[PDB]
Ligand binder design. Structure first.
Ligand SMILES: N[C@H]1CCC[C@H](Nc2cccc(-c3n[nH]c4cnc(-c5cccnc5)cc34)n2)C1
Length: 273
């Protein structure tokens, strides 16, 4: 019975992903997040190592949950008649990147550098564990306001990482690559890099670069804020129209703009405290 193991708090939010509540594990008072997703709303299903029907999200989460905490870890999960309930780690105090950007405006490049680097590390961790997130965006990353550490959330649109083409997509369209818009086909890593380009622009400009399909397809970036030439270059590289023209993750992290990143703690002391 999960109803007695957890003290349910306020609704943190709801949307396509379902409904997520703040919670507290009664045994040790550990802060937690409680996510409800209706079975009717789940189209992507997977198999547990012990042979059982579970949402793919659970499968993916299990594969990425462990030491490296760039990703919010799954602590436990329950099946109900018409829904699944996930119990997830919850940092405190916390704010998602979307709200942070909204309230603070465009981020100083030193801050964006640290945040972007942490996201890259988190995404690399996922890929190394055979998991593709498919919905990297500011709304899906949490900021531990005390430690300056970022955490990736919501694998409800994710999939197992593969080297062949994806022909399905239920992520955020304005973060999706031109090859999806045009051909309904994309490969995991190169598509991820595109979304990262969108994210980086978002960090240093205060808003997303594209709104309509035609803009994504044209792939022309204009800067509304003062942004260094190095940063502009990295962004334009990630947003290359041709997937094969985009940088690998190693290439991104070796880019000149990516050098001399602050540690999470230093980042918090300077920018969050
Ligand atoms: N864009 C917003 C929409 C509302 C959910 C979320 N906000 C917060 C706020 C504090 C903690 C967590 C939190 N702590 N731990 C978590 C684990 N998973 C999720 C989550 C969010 C969305 C979809 N799936 C899972 C959220 C959390 N999430 C992000």
């Amino acid at each position: 019975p999960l109803e007695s193991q957890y003290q349910v708090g306020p609704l943190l939010g709801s949307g396509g992903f379902g409904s997520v509540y703040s919670g507290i594990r009664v045994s040790d008072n550990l802060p937690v997040a409680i996510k409800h997703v209706e079975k009717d709303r789940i189209s992507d299903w997977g198999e547990l190592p012990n042979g059982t029907r579970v949402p793919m999200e659970v499968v993916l989460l299990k594969k990425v949950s462990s030491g490296f905490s760039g990703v919010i870890r799954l602590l436990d999960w329950f099946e109900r008649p018409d829904s699944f309930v996930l119990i997830l780690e919850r940092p405190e105090p916390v704010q998602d990147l979307f709200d942070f950007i909204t309230e603070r405006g465009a981020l100083q490049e030193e801050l964006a550098r640290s945040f972007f680097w942490q996201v890259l590390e988190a995404v690399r961790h996922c890929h190394n564990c055979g998991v593709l997130h498919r919905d990297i965006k500011d709304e899906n990353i949490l900021i531990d306001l005390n430690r300056g550490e970022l955490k990736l959330i919501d694998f409800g649109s994710g999939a197992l990482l593969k080297d062949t083409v994806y022909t399905d997509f239920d992520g955020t369209r304005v973060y999706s690559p031109p090859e999806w818009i045009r051909y309904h086909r994309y490969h995991g890593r190169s598509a991820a890099v595109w979304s990262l380009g969108i994210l980086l622009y978002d960090m240093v400009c205060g808003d997303i670069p594209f709104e309509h399909d035609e803009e994504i397809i044209r792939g022309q970036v204009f800067f509304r804020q003062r942004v260094s030439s190095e940063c502009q270059h990295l962004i334009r590289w990630c947003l290359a129209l041709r997937p094969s023209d985009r940088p690998t993750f190693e290439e991104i992290q070796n880019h000149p703009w990516m050098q001399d990143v602050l540690l999470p703690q230093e980042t918090a002391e300077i920018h969050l405290h």
